[PDB]
A = this chain, B = another copy of it.
Amino acid sequence: LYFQGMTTSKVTYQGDLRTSAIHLQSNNEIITDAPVDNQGKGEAFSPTDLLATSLASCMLTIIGIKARDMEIDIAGTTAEVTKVMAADPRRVSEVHIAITFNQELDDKTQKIFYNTALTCPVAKSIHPDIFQKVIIH
């Protein structure tokens, strides 16, 4: 097929292992840096940190859709993201997401939110061998 679609973002390599990405539609900007572990500036999310975080953002977003449909205000809910790497080749092996809701939730709802989270688009777009560990506090 001869058609190429609308661009999502434009990333610019700025030197010193740093990148800057602009999202076309919104015009918002994101920076990445390599860790000091391999000579980067380390004053921004690394690209793999960004991937780990996108999973958590996706989970909270799809939970928000479900919370909106169920008429549950979940503003102030938080997700602590921890990543584990494997070597040879360097890649993400686990992403641990600890979700803390602003209010008290019953078992049925926690389970709905848990299950909805695991089916989200980013969950289905990362390597299946990655252990996606979600805990609700």
Contact = CB atoms under 8 A, between A and B. Distances in A.
A96 to B, nearest CB: 7
B61 A19 contact: yes
Given A9-B52, A21-B56, A23-B44, 15 more contacts: A4-B96, A9-B53, A10-B79, A13-B64, A13-B76, A15-B74, A19-B56, A26-B33, A26-B42, A26-B43, A34-B65, A47-B55, A50-B50, A91-B121, A128-B128
Interface residues of A, number: 78
Contact of A119 (B12, B51, B89): B89
A134 interface: no
B51 A122 contact: yes
Contacts of A32: 54, 57-58, 61
Given A32-B61, A56-B21, A89-B119, A11 B44 contact: no
B57 A50 contact: yes
A111 interface: no
A108 interface: no
B64 A54 contact: no
